[PDB]
Write a protein that binds this ligand. Structure first.
Ligand code: K
Ligand code: K
Ligand code: MG
Ligand code: MG
Ligand code: MG
Ligand code: MG
Ligand code: MG
Ligand code: MG
Ligand code: MG
Ligand code: MG
Ligand code: MG
Ligand code: MG
Ligand code: MG
Ligand code: MG
Ligand code: MG
Ligand code: MG
Ligand code: MG
Ligand code: MG
Ligand code: MG
Ligand code: MG
Ligand code: MG
Ligand code: MG
Ligand code: MG
Ligand code: ZN
Lengths: 115, 59, 154, 99, 305, 110
RNA sequence: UUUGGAUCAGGACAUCCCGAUGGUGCAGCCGCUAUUAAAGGUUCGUUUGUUCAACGAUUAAAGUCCUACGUGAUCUGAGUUCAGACCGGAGUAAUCCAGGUCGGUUUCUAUCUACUUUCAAAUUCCUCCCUGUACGAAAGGACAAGAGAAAUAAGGCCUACUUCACAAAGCGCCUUCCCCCGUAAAUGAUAUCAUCUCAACUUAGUAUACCCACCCCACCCAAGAACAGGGUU
RNA sequence: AGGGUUCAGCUGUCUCUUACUUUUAACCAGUGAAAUUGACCUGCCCGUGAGGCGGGCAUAACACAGCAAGACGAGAAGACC
């Protein structure tokens, strides 16, 4: 789904993620062995001249059955330690972050909708 | 009684018998003790084969 | 790797294959018996068999009418298709065409097959016939069958 | 809401207090009962301000008062889509063409 | 000096008679072997550690999904055990191996397409000829009298089995398709080199090492899959629902036996030994033997905790 | 790639006279029961096929001379009658193709 | 005073990581040193680009070489350098310059050797329990056996998704099973102590799987270049 | 259609290739070249100066389809004194 030089959409309300030129940040590194990012993976974005770690919440590429497919490749910014930069998420996100192993409780708590 | 042959000196652990299967990295060297354990007649067979003349009559 | 591929690659493409099959089918419809290379005859046999079912569908059927219009280049054959061949095979449910192999043509030693519609008016082909019931092996097997039947009856 | 049963927010005095509370509660959970259900991992060890634990049906978040003010979760989880921040954020927008 | 087939000289009045006669004979021979424990069976021994029992010859029907009570979906391959029988027994001394051998056949075929020696071998055994014959290694206490039928009940759910069969052939293939070589780019001046292997050896040796990966015929060889478990068994249709995929195309014959992995050894204590005997069985088996984790189709909608 | 040496006549013989190169004999030849000419078991007899083809060609020539133009395919059955033949009771309402010859022995009338 | 890149890589250890062992630091966490070990692995990009200069983000690691840059009858970039031309300089001029720059055609039908399924033992991270345990003043923080998840590699498959449709395929799914011996230690004369032993001796790590039979004209095939093979009840 | 560079879009250039059609291809039938060619009954490892020499090893004969590691492949000509 998401790999290097792939445009992503920032879904939280972070001021860094708010783009006044309507330009989209693109990933420059995927923190996985094979470089292919699925739901729940951690990547790096070159956004506004800054390199910020980000957590992907939904992607356009199809996945397993009963798992929602989104029409856009969604991502939420995270700090270097795990605390999300943004405060809330408006668009629904999959609940599979609960099943997946990782630091996701903060994002699930600040999320509003589920699908 | 080819199993009960005797090697003078430390030949049982000094002499080696090296063979190649033809594939890359197929160079194998097994000592006299290992060869005797795997096949008790191999030592005598190889000795006689080596001492025989090198022509079509050796086989 | 061609597993399950039931359509042969022939002609200059799919269009050419369809056109060659259509011409062969039209010739067969007109003449009731033709000869052609073995692969082409084998490919055309299925279309020939299904055309009779489309004729049985009836001329008043729009789908059958359009199919006949496409598959008959000579338009005088559509009334023939809907009024001669279909009534002839009305009783039967299959096996409308018979195909046999014939000696290779002298031009290029190609494998040739002759395909005809059953019930035609042309002289009968020298069909290969099984051995008569009066031969030695058939008589012995018939005796065995009679003995088994009478033993079962008893 | 399809998330959990009991959502708990707790404010401690220091990061050491948060770590001690998390250690004590997880130790009691492991020692009390439920040999069958899966273990629970401490979530947010490297995060000094925030810490989380996710049990089978109860989720607990340890966080300092400053972090609570920054992310006020009580109004979020009481009012679904009726929250202050959420109202201040546009639901969805799409840029159009120029002149 | 001229070739012949069975129905070359048969007449129209005799071909159906011969067909029905041979079909009825085959059916009678198949049915006559359905009572093994009454036709003087070989002695039956209790199970012992270190004992290996005989396997089965199945037919690959297809695959279907199957869900667990945890809600996870796994694909199961249907292996139908049809007309599977034991042909002959060979002793350890005669086979000159560490373990004794047993022969198993299945999927009866026509007698008109088999050699004279095979036909006369099956004539004394009183069974229609089988398509394939496989050899299983067993111990002395696992011997079974020849002519004994075998069924899918020989295995049980939760048991791990290994399946070996000839894979789907692909004919002559290149390096990219056969060994996964990456090839060359399609543009930037490349001249008739897009799938070529490229370099084959080094310049010093002046030869090609034996075993070098080169284009050639691929597939159509015997491969074995290990560590596959049984999720469900259909007793009426003699069908095994093995986990995962198995080598070979549909409607092929696959040899199944117990798993050889050391981590799954000594798991046959509760398995039938040396095999299942429905005729002498006190109780009738259920229609479908499921697994503890398998959610049956008749079971209600699963609600998680 | 150019050859490095001339291949000798012994090597050429060993390659050319190899059993794979040799022509294999056929054991599917039998006499035709009707005319006695040779034929293959799975292939129609050439002599019988060509006599039938010539008769069919004559019949089709008669049919074409009767129709007298393209796009004139009849919508009724066809019956071929030879000299000294009359239309049958069931062969009514069918186009009759007349022939100035004796009916062939193998052409069994219906 | 010659040289890079693509594909395929073979071998050596003077070992980057994965493995054992000794010393070694104040307890663990970690560190340095030393021995043995080639079975396995050793990333993606940017400006450049005579391959080395500057780097960014990862990983257990991003090792040194030989192989006629290993490899160009497999491909390709730069130079060796050209036939045209300019700017700077030399020369009366023709012309020249390892100086700076632009552009610029190696063609090949495999004769010989060798080879064309090594018929199969899998590797590495991360997370949970132990466990916040032993240990620690605190800071901190492991053992050993276990469980899960991920990636790659090898071998297969189409029940779903997708490219597509009697089928092939991945982006999809399934399976993956042994040791490694450097040394640490008993008893004991030479040398009546002691001594692990190029002393006699003890102890510790000092195989199974798959193939296993022998009508054929013709037709079909999940088998296949031809050939061969399976089915034809 | 001059030599470099850039914003956006675009796409199998690539991540990582896959499916199909035509051509080619393989078999059958007809016609039918060229470069090349000392003779060859034309193996591997090590050494020496390498298919032909020395020491070991290997080894019934033979046809078809690929492969390009070697035959300094005449191969392929050019470049330098
Ligand atoms: K080669
Ligand atoms: K030259
Ligand atoms: Mg064609
Ligand atoms: Mg095939
Ligand atoms: Mg694969
Ligand atoms: Mg490619
Ligand atoms: Mg090209
Ligand atoms: Mg060209
Ligand atoms: Mg380059
Ligand atoms: Mg070393
Ligand atoms: Mg070079
Ligand atoms: Mg070369
Ligand atoms: Mg240039
Ligand atoms: Mg150039
Ligand atoms: Mg070539
Ligand atoms: Mg050609
Ligand atoms: Mg020819
Ligand atoms: Mg010439
Ligand atoms: Mg020779
Ligand atoms: Mg010298
Ligand atoms: Mg040499
Ligand atoms: Mg020599
Ligand atoms: Mg050849
Ligand atoms: Zn005849």
């Amino acid at each position: 789904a998401i790999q290097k030089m792939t445009r992503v959409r920032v879904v939280d309300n972070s001021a860094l993620g708010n783009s006044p030129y309507h330009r989209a940040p693109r990933c420059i590194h995927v923190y996985k062995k094979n470089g292919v990012g699925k739901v729940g993976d951690q990547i790096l974005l070159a956004i506004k001249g800054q390199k910020k770690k980000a957590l992907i919440v939904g992607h356009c590429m199809p996945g397993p059955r009963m798992t929602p497919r989104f029409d856009s490749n969604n991502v939420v910014l995270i700090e270097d330690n795990g605390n999300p930069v943004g405060t809330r998420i408006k668009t629904p996100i999959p609940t599979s972050l609960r099943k997946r192993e990782g630091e996701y409780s903060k994002v699930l708590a600040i999320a509003q909708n589920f699908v | 009684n080819t199993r009960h042959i005797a090697f003078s000196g430390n030949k049982w652990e000094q002499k080696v018998y090296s063979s190649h299967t033809g594939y890359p990295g197929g160079f194998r060297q097994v000592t006299a003790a290992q060869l005797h354990l795997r096949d008790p007649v191999a030592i005598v067979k190889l000795a006689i084969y080596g001492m025989l003349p090198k022509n079509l009559h050796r086989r | 790797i061609s597993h399950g591929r039931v359509f042969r690659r022939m002609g200059l493409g799919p269009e050419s294959r369809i056109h060659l099959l259509r011409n062969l089918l039209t010739g067969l419809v007109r003449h009731e018996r033709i000869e052609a290379p073995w692969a082409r005859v084998d490919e055309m046999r299925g279309y020939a068999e299904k055309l009779i079912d489309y004729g049985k569908l009836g001329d008043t059927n729009e789908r059958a009418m359009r199919m006949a219009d496409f598959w008959l280049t000579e338009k005088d054959l559509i009334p023939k298709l809907f009024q001669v061949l279909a009534p002839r095979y009305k009783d039967q449910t299959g096996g409308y065409t018979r195909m046999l192999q014939i000696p290779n043509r002298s031009l290029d030693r190609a494998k040739m097959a002759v395909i005809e519609y059953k019930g035609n008016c042309l002289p009968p082909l020298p069909l290969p016939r099984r051995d008569s019931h009066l031969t030695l092996l058939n008589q012995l097997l018939q005796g065995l069958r009679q003995d088994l039947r009478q033993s079962q009856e008893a | 809401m399809r998330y959990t049963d009991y959502f708990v927010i707790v404010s401690g005095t220091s990061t050491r207090h948060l770590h001690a509370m998390a250690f004590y509660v997880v130790k009691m959970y492991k020692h009390l009962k439920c040999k069958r259900d899966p273990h629970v991992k401490i979530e947010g060890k490297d995060t000094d301000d925030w810490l989380c634990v996710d049990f089978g049906s109860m989720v607990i978040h340890l966080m300092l008062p400053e972090t609570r003010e920054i992310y006020e979760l009580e109004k979020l989880w009481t009012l679904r889509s009726y929250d202050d921040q959420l109202a201040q954020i546009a639901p969805e927008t799409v840029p159009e063409d120029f002149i | 000096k001229s070739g012949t087939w069975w129905d070359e000289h048969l007449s129209e009045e005799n071909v159906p008679f011969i067909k029905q006669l041979v079909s009825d004979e085959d059916k009678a021979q198949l049915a006559s072997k359905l009572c093994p424990l009454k036709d003087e069976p070989w002695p039956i021994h209790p199970w012992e550690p270190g004992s290996f029992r005989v396997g089965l010859i199945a037919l690959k029907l297809g695959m279907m999904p199957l869900w667990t009570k945890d809600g996870q979906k796994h694909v199961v391959t249907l292996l139908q055990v049809q007309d599977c029988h034991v042909l002959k027994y060979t002793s350890k001394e005669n086979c000159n191996g560490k373990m004794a051998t047993l022969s198993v056949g299945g999927k009866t075929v026509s007698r008109f397409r088999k050699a004279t020696s095979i036909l006369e071998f099956y004539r004394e055994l009183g069974l229609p000829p089988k398509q394939t014959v496989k050899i299983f290694n067993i111990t002395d206490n696992a011997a079974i009298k020849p002519g004994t039928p075998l069924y899918a009940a020989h295995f049980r759910p939760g048991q791990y089995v290994d399946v070996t069969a000839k894979t789907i052939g692909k004919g002559f293939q290149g390096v990219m398709k056969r060994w996964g070589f990456k090839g060359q780019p399609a543009t930037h001046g490349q001249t008739k080199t897009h799938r070529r292997p490229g370099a084959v050896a080094t310049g010093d040796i002046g030869r090609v090492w034996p075993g070098t990966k080169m284009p050639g015929k691929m597939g159509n060889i015997y491969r074995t899959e290990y560590g596959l478990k049984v999720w469900r068994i259909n007793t009426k249709h003699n069908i095994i629902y093995v986990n995962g995929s198995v080598p070979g195309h549909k409607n092929c014959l696959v040899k199944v036996k117990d798993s050889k992995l050391p981590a799954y050894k000594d798991l046959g204590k509760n398995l039938p030994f040396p095999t299942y005997f429905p005729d002498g069985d006190e109780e009738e088996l259920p229609e479908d033997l499921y697994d503890e984790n398998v959610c049956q189709p008749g079971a209600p909608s699963i609600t998680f905790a | 790639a150019a050859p490095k040496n001339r291949r000798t006549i012994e090597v050429n013989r060993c390659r050319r006279r190899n059993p794979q190169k040799l022509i294999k004999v056929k054991n599917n030849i039998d006499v035709c029961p009707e005319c006695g000419h040779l034929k293959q078991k799975h292939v129609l007899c050439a002599y019988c096929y060509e006599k039938v083809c010539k008769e069919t060609a004559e019949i089709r020539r008669q049919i074409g001379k009767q129709e007298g133009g393209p796009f004139k395919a009849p919508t009724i059955e066809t019956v071929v009658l030879y000299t000294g033949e009359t239309p049958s009771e069931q062969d009514q309402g069918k186009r009759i193709i007349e022939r100035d010859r004796k009916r062939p022995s193998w052409f069994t009338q219906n």
